[PDB]
Design an enzyme around this catalytic site. Structure first.
Site, PDB file in Angstrom:
ATOM      1  N   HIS A  61       0.823  -1.215   0.000  1.00  0.00           N
ATOM      2  CA  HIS A  61       0.000   0.000   0.000  1.00  0.00           C
ATOM      3  C   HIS A  61       0.846   1.249   0.000  1.00  0.00           C
ATOM      4  O   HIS A  61       0.581   2.168  -0.830  1.00  0.00           O
ATOM      5  CB  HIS A  61      -0.851   0.072   1.260  1.00  0.00           C
ATOM      6  N   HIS A  91       5.670   7.115   6.535  1.00  0.00           N
ATOM      7  CA  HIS A  91       5.318   6.714   5.180  1.00  0.00           C
ATOM      8  C   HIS A  91       4.777   7.924   4.452  1.00  0.00           C
ATOM      9  O   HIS A  91       4.543   8.956   5.043  1.00  0.00           O
ATOM     10  CB  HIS A  91       4.329   5.583   5.185  1.00  0.00           C
ATOM     11  N   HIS A  93       1.941   9.284   1.147  1.00  0.00           N
ATOM     12  CA  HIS A  93       0.843   9.097   0.220  1.00  0.00           C
ATOM     13  C   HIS A  93       1.132  10.004  -0.959  1.00  0.00           C
ATOM     14  O   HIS A  93       1.540  11.166  -0.776  1.00  0.00           O
ATOM     15  CB  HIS A  93      -0.494   9.499   0.855  1.00  0.00           C
ATOM     16  N   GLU A 103      -3.526  13.660   1.360  1.00  0.00           N
ATOM     17  CA  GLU A 103      -4.765  13.229   2.017  1.00  0.00           C
ATOM     18  C   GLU A 103      -5.506  14.417   2.601  1.00  0.00           C
ATOM     19  O   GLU A 103      -6.646  14.718   2.209  1.00  0.00           O
ATOM     20  CB  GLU A 103      -4.437  12.159   3.031  1.00  0.00           C
ATOM     21  N   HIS A 116       3.564  11.159   6.571  1.00  0.00           N
ATOM     22  CA  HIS A 116       2.960  10.887   7.861  1.00  0.00           C
ATOM     23  C   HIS A 116       4.018  10.262   8.756  1.00  0.00           C
ATOM     24  O   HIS A 116       4.501   9.149   8.464  1.00  0.00           O
ATOM     25  CB  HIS A 116       1.784   9.935   7.729  1.00  0.00           C
ATOM     26  N   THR A 195      -5.797   6.721   8.343  1.00  0.00           N
ATOM     27  CA  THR A 195      -6.361   6.946   7.004  1.00  0.00           C
ATOM     28  C   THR A 195      -6.366   5.720   6.110  1.00  0.00           C
ATOM     29  O   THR A 195      -6.799   5.796   4.976  1.00  0.00           O
ATOM     30  CB  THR A 195      -5.685   8.129   6.288  1.00  0.00           C
ATOM     31  N   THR A 196      -5.943   4.574   6.633  1.00  0.00           N
ATOM     32  CA  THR A 196      -6.042   3.268   6.010  1.00  0.00           C
ATOM     33  C   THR A 196      -6.803   2.370   6.950  1.00  0.00           C
ATOM     34  O   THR A 196      -6.727   2.506   8.191  1.00  0.00           O
ATOM     35  CB  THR A 196      -4.595   2.709   5.787  1.00  0.00           C
TER      36      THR A 196
HETATM   37 CO   LIG Z   1      -0.693   7.881   6.251  1.00  0.00          CO
END
Ligand SMILES: [Co+2]
Length: 257
Positions: A61, A91, A93, A103, A116, A195-196
């Protein structure tokens, strides 16, 4: 079996994770005119001088840069937080194109990517217990815009070819996360969620106002990663962001006047 495609992406997540439609979901749009300066916020303290990175993992992901969190070595305190939060991983996005990828949004503006740095509240002993608490986690979110290269990101970019596919990892010691921070620590804060999946409502979000700049070449190298495993048809790792969710009965506070 969740992901970011048409058939398994964010609009599907609620079926296995009903909290996706909860009262405290992330990300959100940060409406800068509605957010209020809070003079009760104490100064934010980011203490990453003794950070010990260990490994980098493609989890199918995103990629996680993992840290040794067995001791208070890299910690977040102050601001909206009570007590000490320990860094466990970071990580990103990002998008398929420079016009999307973050995000959080700021007055509906999407950045090319978002970093993040995930921290857990030491009062709960470990991350797994922390994600059972409404103040379990603190995530420092940093926007990325495309412009000049970020020198402190290059060691990340250059190892991504070694972790191309899901499940691959590489040693990643001696990485200094200070080099990913912007100059200013001005921020917005609000209570939210992962957020996942599993989308747990355990996070105090601290979103910095000043983006970092990364180069087009750096973000293009993120987009060469794969969501798939080795020997499977290639699915580029792009657009691994959840869109903004309803703010509901929440207030976003600003640290700056
Ligand atoms: Co995140």
């Amino acid at each position: 079996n969740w992901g970011y495609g048409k058939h398994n992406g964010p609009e599907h997540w609620h079926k296995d994770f009903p909290i996706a439609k909860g009262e405290r979901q992330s990300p959100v749009d940060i409406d800068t005119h509605t957010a209020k300066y809070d003079p009760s916020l104490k100064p934010l303290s980011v203490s990453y001088d003794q950070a010990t990175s260990l490994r980098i993992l493609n989890n199918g992901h995103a990629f996680n840069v993992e840290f040794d969190d067995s001791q208070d070595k890299a910690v977040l305190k102050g601001g909206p937080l009570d007590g000490t939060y320990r860094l466990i991983q970071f990580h990103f996005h990002w998008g398929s194109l420079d016009g999307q990828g973050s995000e959080h949004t700021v007055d509906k503006k999407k950045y090319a990517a978002e970093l993040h740095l995930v921290h857990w509240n030491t009062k709960y002993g470990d991350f797994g217990k922390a994600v059972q608490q409404p103040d379990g986690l603190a995530v420092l979110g940093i926007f990325l815009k495309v412009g000049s290269a970020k020198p402190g990101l290059q060691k990340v970019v250059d190892v991504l070819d070694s972790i191309k596919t899901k499940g691959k990892s590489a040693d990643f010691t001696n990485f200094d996360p200070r080099g990913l921070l912007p100059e200013s620590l001005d921020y917005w804060t609000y209570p939210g969620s992962l957020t996942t999946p599993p989308l747990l409502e355990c996070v105090t979000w601290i979103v910095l106002k000043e983006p970092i700049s990364v180069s087009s070449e750096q973000v293009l190298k993120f987009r060469k990663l794969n969501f798939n495993g080795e020997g499977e048809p290639e699915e580029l790792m792009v657009d691994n962001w959840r869109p903004a969710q309803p703010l509901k009965n929440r207030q976003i506070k600003a640290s700056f006047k």
